[PDB]
Design a protein around this ligand. Structure first.
Ligand code: CTP
Ligand code: CTP
Ligand code: MG
Ligand code: MG
Length: 330
């Protein structure tokens, strides 16, 4: 392996988090929550003199897709799980259904919170986000997620067509073998970049989902095959330079009539239902700051290439990737 490739592979080793299938801890913490949901629904529904609805859980998010990273000191693990309740969506309000889940987890961990798109339960060092779905068998074949907050109007409480497994398939299937490894490594690099240079639980923070979907559209492998030996070498720095430049190229200056100015906006559609712009909640100013840091990271990746000293090349990247990017002495 070439010098800088070695440093990127070490970085990847430091930031990577084992996926559900390879991580006893995540499964046990996930299962602790799923049990406290089953236990809690018995109490809730018996209280109401009915039988508890049942549910099928399924792994979701980066922990299901092998694109998870370790948080920086003071951050939390983000344990994503779907639950398919044995109900017909047309018999029930979506927020009422998320209320069941909230009520069931009342006393567990550090309390539960109905978010727009999940119920989140808190533990020291991690949160589980429960995406709550109706039975497609009882709901007309489509899998629909419970959207809405308690404090949200009729228009904003809906059952929306969802395809998390379709998304997981799309991320798993785009490439194979060492090509798909480089894709996953590069998604992780940008998640640590997000964590280092952006604010946690700030919309300003370009979501993992968005960088994942950007990679789906625009990631390109960077490798070389030796003409004579057929030996293959990967260039994660070059893969990241092409990918970041492509993202930057896809921003469009978008007039805002309210502010009487333009903001650069990057649109990234989910490639499965509901095909929404995953970055649609980011403001114009948050989009402006996103583009500027994306550009400074591009400028770093190019500078890294032309440095004579491994030390200076690695320092330029660590300015963007944080203190776990290895910097050898000069
Ligand atoms: N706007 C969104 C947000 C989330 N999801 C779905 O919910 C999952 C969990 O979302 P999130 O935890 O935000 O993303 P991850 O892909 O897990 O990324 P990260 O590692 O940064 O948490 C996504 O993978 C996706 O299947 C979605 O469809 N649309
Ligand atoms: N289709 C989706 C959308 C979101 N999520 C979960 O919810 C989170 C993203 O929520 P988001 O829609 O970005 O929240 P807001 O609309 O900002 O909601 P609120 O104002 O309640 O915070 C992710 O971590 C993921 O676990 C999901 O599982 N599936
Ligand atoms: Mg996640
Ligand atoms: Mg989450």
């Amino acid at each position: 392996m070439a010098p800088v490739q070695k440093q990127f592979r070490e970085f990847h080793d430091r930031i990577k988090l084992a996926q559900y299938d390879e991580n006893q801890t995540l499964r046990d913490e996930r299962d602790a929550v799923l049990t406290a949901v089953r236990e809690g629904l018995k109490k809730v529904f018996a209280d109401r003199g009915e039988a508890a609805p049942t549910f099928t859980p399924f792994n979701q998010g980066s922990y299901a897709m092998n694109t998870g990273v370790k948080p920086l000191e003071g951050g939390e693990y983000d344990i994503d799980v779907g639950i398919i309740l044995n109900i017909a969506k047309d018999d029930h309000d979506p927020v009422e259904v998320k209320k069941w889940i909230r009520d069931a987890l009342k006393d567990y961990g550090n309390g539960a919170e109905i978010r727009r798109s999940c119920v989140t339960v808190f533990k020291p060092g991690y949160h589980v986000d429960l995406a709550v779905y109706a039975d497609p068998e009882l709901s007309g074949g489509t899998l629909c997620i419970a959207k809405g907050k308690e404090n949200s109007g009729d228009e904003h409480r809906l059952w929306q067509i969802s395809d998390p497994q379709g998304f997981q398939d799309r991320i798993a299937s785009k490439l194979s073998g060492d090509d798909a490894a480089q894709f996953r490594r590069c998604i992780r690099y940008l998640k640590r970049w997000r964590d280092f240079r952006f604010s946690s639980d700030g919309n300003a923070a370009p979501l993992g989902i968005g960088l994942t979907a950007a990679a789906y559209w625009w990631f390109q492998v960077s490798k070389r095959t030796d003409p004579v030996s057929q030996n293959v070498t990967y260039d994660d720095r070059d893969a990241l330079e092409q990918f970041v430049q492509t993202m930057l190229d896809n921003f469009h200056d978008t007039w805002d009539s309210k502010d009487q100015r333009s903001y650069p906006r990057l649109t990234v559609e989910l490639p499965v239902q509901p095909y929404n712009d995953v970055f649609e909640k980011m403001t114009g100013m948050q989009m402006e700051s996103f583009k500027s840091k994306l550009q400074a990271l591009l400028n770093a990746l190019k500078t890294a290439k032309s440095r004579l000293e491994l030390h200076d090349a690695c320092k330029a990247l660590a300015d963007h990737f944080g203190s776990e990017f290895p910097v050898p002495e000069k």
